[PDB]
């Protein structure tokens, strides 16, 4: 497991 | 080292921090007498300067 | 009549500032600029500033002159606005004049009327002043110290100009 | 305000020459000493910026950023203890000149002074 | 004050107004701009005269050189905005937001 | 992974201010606080009534 | 993802939806 | 523009803000106002977009409306006094005019609807000289009449400004419109003390016009004017988007980072005045600037956002240009707290 | 190794020479005006 | 941040037209020239506040 | 160069020339082009840019020895030859990669041009790169939003540039192409559908050569007047393109133009737009190894002339 | 059913953070109206001029 | 300045109905600032919509504020205790209520009321240990 890191979905919100 | 040490420097960390809150009352209370009266050094704000002014004789008499 | 020619010129002023402040067509706000800047010099004039108030009328007699070519270059429209030709405009205008008769009425008739200030009913003779400049126009000499005290006006004012000019070609330039 | 108007001050002086009788700054002054630790920082940071070697390169570049903070740093410290020293000379003068606005107090020992006390029950 | 004053200064207000209230042209809204500028001509030579600030007559005629320097501006930010819509109509400066 | 979500993470997207819930939250979250609060206070206030009256045994405690 | 739980289900799309997420039948859902 | 020209139009500019800080009389100082309104103009516009020209307009009819208010109340004063030193104002109508107006030019709401709107239309070096010098000559001119300034005028605006500006950026995604937003927050702090202490003003003016110099010169260096641009720095130059993190921090006025010292004096001011209410409903309201703060730290440098792969090109090259002064603006406003007492020297 | 010389390439010795000696110069300036200022202070003050 | 250049280099690039009783051309008065002095004269180094 | 040059009074109108011209020469895949370029440029005394490929920045940079295809570019053209449709994404990568490619190569031509005098010979250009596009999107190869994509990219970096002044088409048949192909013996290429080649064909003809004719004149050659240089020089000298751009540039616009090609970063600013498509989006973890890998290349670590590794000097006093 | 979710997870929630955040939210889209005419808000600068006249005399 | 005066003039705890007007007086009075403001910056469609939009405003402001006076002067004269903020607040949760209701939000209604009422004992507490919204400059 790795340390989560913004998807583009999370991208796009901004 | 030997309790006379902490016993001194309590006594003497104590008079500064008090010598300076009296200090800073003081200070206080001056610049609040100073602002409302004006009579000052602090807070004597601009006024015109009377060199400025002629006293030269002026056109008309009545001046 | 003749007593009051001050007071009757400074409502002509309020109308054409009422004229050109409900917004006709540039043309008819030019008009009321032109009638308000007339106006405005005979009121100086009155007072004793005939250099000043002639300065006013000519300077914005040439500024209306671009400001009328300007307007049939880019404010135009096909059917120009005339005071009665929309009900914003006229309700502007009449708005304006109303306005201005009910605070002239309620000065004119009461002794003292305060709006934001205090104003004083009686005519404007009352105030001026009963000394001689003898042999001397004062505007004329004060204007006329432009160049002898206020050098520093002059330095300032040049350099605002000169940038000015090289402000209106950038700002026209349009890459 | 307060002091801008004080009578006798020179218009854009740093340090008036009556801040000379007070003692110079030492030049081991902590606060000196943090500036040119400043001064550092921000030579570490402009090799950061630029990609350099953050802690080697530029050691010329870095001593210029130490001896300027530490210079200017110097004269800071001069002049804000001249102007606090200002503020306490101003302040005892008003308080000799108006005694009643600054009256002493009877001195009253604990013994004589009645305080209640709250029990914590 | 007289009463000259208060048209005067009822002028400053109403240019004021029309300024603030714009309806489809700059054109006028320059126009109004002027004419605040010409009603503080007025009230500022009428001060001057009536108490003889000689040195004071003067003033009118920067703060004029300045209302031309303004009107100038103006104009030509007016030409770009043109050129770019077409229009004098400010509703077209409308790309930026908030 | 869908029990552990359900029980900590979907309850406050899925839940709506009602006349239940609002009712149940008042009741279960200030209701025993001011019964806690009543109980304490009279008894608190008792304990000072009697200390006043000088009704109250504290011969041996010295130790609060 | 759609496997996480979900709102109420409202429509019987949506129920049908829920029950194949939850790895039920339908009815039993 | 050539560069004589933009130079020459520059230091017009920086005159006519001289001519305001350096002038005994009113006409000057109008003069000096009206001499950075036209420089400013070409300069605002030195990229030709229609955006650059809209914002042009909506900043030219703004300032020249402020001016012809200002000149309205210096004309009155002269009226009711017949002086033009600046001075105590002797009429109060004047004196709520000139407030007006000079709160309309730093943006103070309820006259901040220009600010962002113009911030975003110029471009980023245009947005730094727009947020950080403009703002000195209308402070200027406030403090040297902040004895007439009527306190609750101006602490009204100045809460509307903090509230206004914290609201505004939250809803922003853009990196000029939220440093407007800020930039009319920080200015509502200011402008609260400037009825107390003129000092607390000026050191305020000092750190914000530090931060915001080294926060525009940030964006400059990254070429980013949204936040998803700001997010790909990470994967070209990490060390931008963390001192942009520290910095944000700062503004934020997290302790112990030099944003707190303006926050604190002017709390400790306000309330020596028995001001307690007020700094406490600034304080708390400026825990919004906090959050669009730490959203945008977020984006940038405490979590990685997706790159693209044209980025691959970029490692390659090296940055051309050299901002000399962003290190020590970035040192002087993240780390100058420790030299607080400092502060008696602009005294 | 590169085949675009280095924009830095060798230390550009006057830069080098200049930063140094106003490093220099204002140490020194700094030091002296420490040491007339402490002169002031002990003369002024006795 | 008035920074009075103007006194600092002894230079009188505008206190000339700050008063009304400074000097005029061909020394025309002004119309309360005599008002003006006096008041001048009255609050000069007291300081703002005293002369209110 | 610098705003303080221009102010001294370094202008690029005086050190360019008659020589001084950028001429492009586009063709079909195998059309013989480089023949030519090589020969003009050699002929007009011109410096020739090879036609840019996948790792011309590498070229530029550092060493100059190519990087490894994680490091620089993460797409490969034998790939696309021979999986054309791949759901990697490698299509699209290869045709922004190359824009890019050929975006920078320009910018370096103008600067030579602006700096030094000299005509620049370019294989290809910016302008002509849509024509593979066209024919990725007409062939299924790319979907529409790539295309979207890349004309977004295009408008906001070409403008600023000035196009070329004469356009060099070398025109041969896409059957002889084929053939060629074949000759040539490259196994990759050999899998290129004749259909491709046409659209290729097609988007130049159709688009390229009448845009490009609008603004200049464009010098189109059989394959057998190709190979004729030195008739082809001879065209170029006879030339009289007084329509155009480069005759209304003046000093402040090669000012704006010099300073902009130095800055290669401004130059490929807006490559990067964030446009999140899925074939050219690399997540976070991807690219932060990718980046460290990048960094511990040798000469790469710090800024150039700065790295000890490579045995750069004097690094405390530089 | 009570102390985890009625309380901890829903209903000190909405009392202290959520709310504020919502009112705040709102606020923001209230104050970034993303209007951008001068005709409407310089009509809000005749009001805030007419208001403080008559309200700071 | 006027209807703040006329507010704090009546005795609190005393003619209620004098009260209940001038708190009237006041939410009008800001209701009606808030219509001009949302005019200017949201353009009414029609001058019927504006005035629509003005006394929707105007009168839940007024209803808040008569509301608010009702309420707090009443319970002022029945507990008989006329400092106790708590008379305050009791009436700013009313307002909120009020303001719910015009909403037809119980969400709204509640909130309100919580922070309403809240804010109206603070500036009652305020009214009786002097506290300072805005400060004289005194140093």
């Known amino acids: 497991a790795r340390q989560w890191q913004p998807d583009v979905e999370w991208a796009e919100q901004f | 080292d030997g309790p006379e040490k902490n016993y001194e420097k309590t006594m003497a960390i104590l008079q500064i921090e008090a010598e300076k809150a009296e200090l800073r009352l003081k200070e206080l209370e001056v610049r609040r007498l100073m602002r409302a009266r004006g009579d000052g050094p602090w807070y004597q704000y601009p006024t015109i300067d009377k060199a400025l002014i002629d006293h030269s004789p002026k056109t008309t008499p009545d001046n | 009549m003749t007593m009051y020619i001050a007071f009757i010129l400074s409502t002509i002023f309020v109308i054409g500032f009422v004229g050109f402040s409900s917004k006709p067509s ?150 | 305000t307060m002091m801008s108007g004080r009578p006798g001050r020179v218009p854009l002086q740093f340090l008036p020459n009556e801040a000379r009788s007070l003692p110079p700054p030492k030049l081991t002054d902590p606060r000196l000493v943090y500036m040119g630790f400043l001064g550092y920082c921000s030579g570490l940071i402009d090799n950061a910026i630029r990609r350099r070697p953050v802690v080697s390169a530029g050691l010329h570049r870095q001593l210029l950023y130490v001896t300027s903070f530490v210079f200017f740093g110097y004269y800071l410290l001069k002049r804000q203890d001249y102007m606090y020293a200002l503020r306490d000379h101003d302040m005892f003068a008003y308080v000799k000149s108006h005694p009643e606005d600054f009256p002493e107090k009877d001195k009253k020992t604990y013994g004589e002074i009645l305080e209640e006390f709250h029990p914590v029950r | 004050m007289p009463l000259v004053y208060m048209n005067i200064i009822m002028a400053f207000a109403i240019a004021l107004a029309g300024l603030l209230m714009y309806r489809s042209h700059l054109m006028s809204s320059l126009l109004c701009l002027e004419g605040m500028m010409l009603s503080l001509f007025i009230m500022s030579t009428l001060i001057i005269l009536n108490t003889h600030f000689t040195l004071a007559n003067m003033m009118p005629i920067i703060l004029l050189v300045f209302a031309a320097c303004e009107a100038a501006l103006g104009l030509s930010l007016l030409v770009m905005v043109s050129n770019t819509y077409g229009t004098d109509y400010v509703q077209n400066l409308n790309l930026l937001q908030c | 992974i869908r029990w552990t979500y359900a029980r900590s993470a979907n309850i406050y997207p899925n839940f709506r201010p009602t006349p239940k819930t609002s009712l149940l939250g008042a009741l279960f979250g200030i209701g025993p606080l001011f019964f806690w609060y009543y109980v304490f206070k009279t008894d608190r206030d008792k304990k000072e009534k009697l200390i006043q009256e000088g009704k109250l045994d504290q011969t041996f405690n010295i130790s609060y | 993802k759609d496997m996480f739980p979900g709102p109420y289900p409202k429509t019987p799309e949506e129920r049908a939806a829920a029950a194949k997420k939850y790895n039920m039948r339908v009815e039993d859902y | 523009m050539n560069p004589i020209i933009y130079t020459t139009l520059i230091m017009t500019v920086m005159s006519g803000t001289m001519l305001v800080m350096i002038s005994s009389h009113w006409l000057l100082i109008w003069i000096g106002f009206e001499m950075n309104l036209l420089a400013m103009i070409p300069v605002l516009m030195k990229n030709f977009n229609p955006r650059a020209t809209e914002a042009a307009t909506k900043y030219f009819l703004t300032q020249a409306t402020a001016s012809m208010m200002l000149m309205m109340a210096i004309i009155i004063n002269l009226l009711y006094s017949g002086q033009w030193t600046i001075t105590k104002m002797f009429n109060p109508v004047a004196m709520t005019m000139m407030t007006m107006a000079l709160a309309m030019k730093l943006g103070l709401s309820p006259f901040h609807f220009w600010v962002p709107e113009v911030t975003q239309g110029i471009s980023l070096q245009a947005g730094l000289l727009l947020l950080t010098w403009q703002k000195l000559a209308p402070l200027s001119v406030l403090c040297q009449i902040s ?170 090259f090296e940055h051309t240009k050299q901002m000399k002064l962003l290190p020590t603006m970035i040192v002087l406003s993240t780390l100058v707290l420790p030299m607080t007492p400092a502060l008696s020297s602009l005294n | 190794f590169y085949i675009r010389e280095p924009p830095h390439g060798s230390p550009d010795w006057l830069k080098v020479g200049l930063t140094l000696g106003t490093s220099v110069f204002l140490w020194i300036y700094l030091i002296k005006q420490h040491k007339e200022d402490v002169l002031e202070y002990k003369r002024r003050n006795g | 941040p008035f920074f009075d250049v103007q006194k600092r280099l002894g230079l009188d690039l505008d206190r000339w037209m700050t008063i009304q009783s400074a000097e005029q051309p061909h020394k025309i008065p002004g119309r309360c020239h005599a008002f003006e002095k006096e008041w001048i004269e009255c609050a000069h180094g007291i300081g703002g506040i005293r002369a209110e | 160069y610098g705003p303080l040059a221009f102010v001294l009074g370094e202008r690029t109108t005086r050190k360019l020339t008659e020589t ?180 290729i064909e097609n988007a130049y003809k159709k688009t390229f050569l009448p845009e490009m004719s609008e603004k200049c004149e464009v010098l189109q050659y059989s394959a057998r007047e190709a190979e004729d240089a030195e008739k082809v020089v001879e065209d170029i000298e006879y030339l009289k393109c007084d329509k155009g751009p480069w005759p209304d540039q003046d000093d402040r616009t090669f000012h704006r133009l010099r300073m902009l090609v130095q800055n290669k970063l401004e130059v490929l600013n807006y490559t990067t737009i964030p446009v999140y498509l899925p074939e050219i989006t690399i997540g976070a973890h991807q690219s932060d190894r990718v980046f460290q890998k990048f960094t511990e290349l040798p000469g790469r670590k710090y800024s150039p002339g700065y790295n000890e590794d490579v045995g750069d000097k004097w690094i405390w006093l530089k | 059913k009570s102390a985890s979710s009625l309380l901890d997870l829903i209903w000190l929630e909405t009392i202290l953070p959520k709310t504020t955040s919502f009112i705040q939210m709102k606020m923001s889209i209230m104050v970034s109206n993303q209007k951008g005419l001068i005709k409407l808000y310089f009509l809000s600068f005749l009001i805030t001029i007419m208001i403080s006249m008559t309200l700071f005399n | 300045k006027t209807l ?87 009436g700013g949760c009313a307002g909120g209520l009020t303001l719910g209701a015009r909403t037809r939000s119980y969400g709204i209604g509640a909130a309100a009321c919580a922070y309403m009422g809240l804010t109206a004992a603070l500036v009652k507490m305020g009214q009786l240990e002097g506290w300072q919204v805005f400060a004289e400059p005194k140093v």
């Open chain 11, 20 to 199: 001084s011209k950028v001429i492009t020469v586009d063709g079909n895949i195998c059309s013989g082009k480089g023949r030519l370029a090589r020969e003009i440029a050699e002929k007009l005394g011109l410096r020739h840019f090879p036609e840019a490929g996948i790792h011309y920045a590498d070229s530029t940079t550092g060493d100059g020895k190519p990087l490894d295809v994680q490091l620089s570019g993460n797409c490969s053209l034998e790939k696309f030859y021979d999986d054309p449709k791949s759901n990697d994404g490698n299509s699209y990568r290869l045709q922004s990669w190359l824009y890019a490619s050929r975006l920078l190569q320009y910018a370096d031509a103008l600067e030579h041009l602006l700096s030094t005098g000299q005509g620049v010979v370019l294989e290809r250009s910016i302008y002509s790169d849509f024509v593979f596009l066209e024919a990725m999107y007409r062939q299924g190869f790319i979907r529409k939003q790539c295309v979207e994509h890349y004309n977004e990219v295009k408008k906001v970096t070409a403008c600023e540039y000035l196009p070329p002044h004469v356009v060099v088409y070398v025109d041969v048949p896409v059957p002889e192409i084929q053939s060629r192909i074949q000759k040539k013996g490259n196994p990759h290429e050999m899998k290129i559908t004749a259909a491709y080649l046409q659209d």
């Open chain 8, 147 to 316: 004895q007439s300034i009527n306190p609750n005028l101006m602490l009204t605006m100045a809460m509307l400004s903090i509230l206004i500006g914290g609201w505004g950026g939250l809803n922003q995604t853009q990196l000029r419109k939220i440093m407007a937003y800020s930039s009319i927050a920080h200015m509502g702090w200011m402008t609260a003390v400037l009825p107390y202490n003129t000092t607390m003003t000026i050191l305020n003016l000092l750190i914000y016009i530090t931060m915001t110099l080294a926060m525009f010169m940030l964006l400059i260096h990254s070429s980013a004017t949204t936040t998803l641009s700001l997010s790909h720095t990470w994967n070209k130059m990490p060390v931008i988007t963390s001192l942009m993190m520290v910095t944000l921090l700062s503004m934020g006025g997290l302790p112990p980072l030099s944003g707190f010292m303006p926050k604190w004096m002017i709390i400790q001011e306000m309330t020596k005045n028995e001001s307690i209410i007020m700094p406490t409903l600034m304080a708390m309201t400026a825990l919004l600037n906090l959050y669009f703060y730490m959203r945008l730290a977020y984006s940038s440098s405490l979590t990685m956002f997706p790159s693209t792969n044209n980025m691959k090109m970029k490692w390659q």
């Open chain 13, 4 to 90: 703040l005066h006329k507010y704090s003039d009546i005795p609190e705890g005393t003619e209620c109905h004098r009260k209940a007007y001038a708190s009237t007086s006041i939410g009008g009075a800001t209701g009606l600032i808030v219509s001009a403001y949302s005019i200017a910056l949201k353009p009414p469609a029609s001058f019927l919509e504006g005035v629509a939009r003005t006394g929707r405003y105007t009168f839940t402001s007024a209803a808040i504020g008569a509301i608010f006076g009702l309420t707090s002067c009443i319970s002022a004269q029945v507990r008989e205790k006329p400092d106790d903020p708590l008379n305050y607040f009791i």
């Open chain 3, 26 to 175: 540039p043309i008819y706000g030019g008009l009321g600029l032109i009638v308000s800047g007339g106006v405005g010099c005979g009121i100086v004039l009155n007072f004793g500033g005939s250099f000043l108030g002639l300065m006013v009328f000519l300077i914005y007699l040439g500024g209306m002159l671009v400001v009328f070519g300007y307007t049939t270059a880019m404010a135009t429209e096909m059917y120009p606005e005339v005071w009665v030709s929309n009900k914003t405009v006229f309700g502007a205008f009449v708005s304006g004049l109303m306005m201005e008769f009910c605070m002239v009425y309620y000065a004119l008739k009461e002794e003292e009327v305060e709006i934001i200030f205090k104003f004083n009913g009686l005519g404007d003779w009352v105030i001026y002043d009963t000394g001689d400049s003898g042999f001397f126009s004062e505007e004329a000499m004060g204007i006329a110290a432009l160049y002898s005290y206020g050098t520093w006006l002059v330095i300032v004012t040049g350099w605002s100009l000169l940038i000015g000019v090289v402000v209106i070609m950038e700002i026209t330039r349009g890459n």
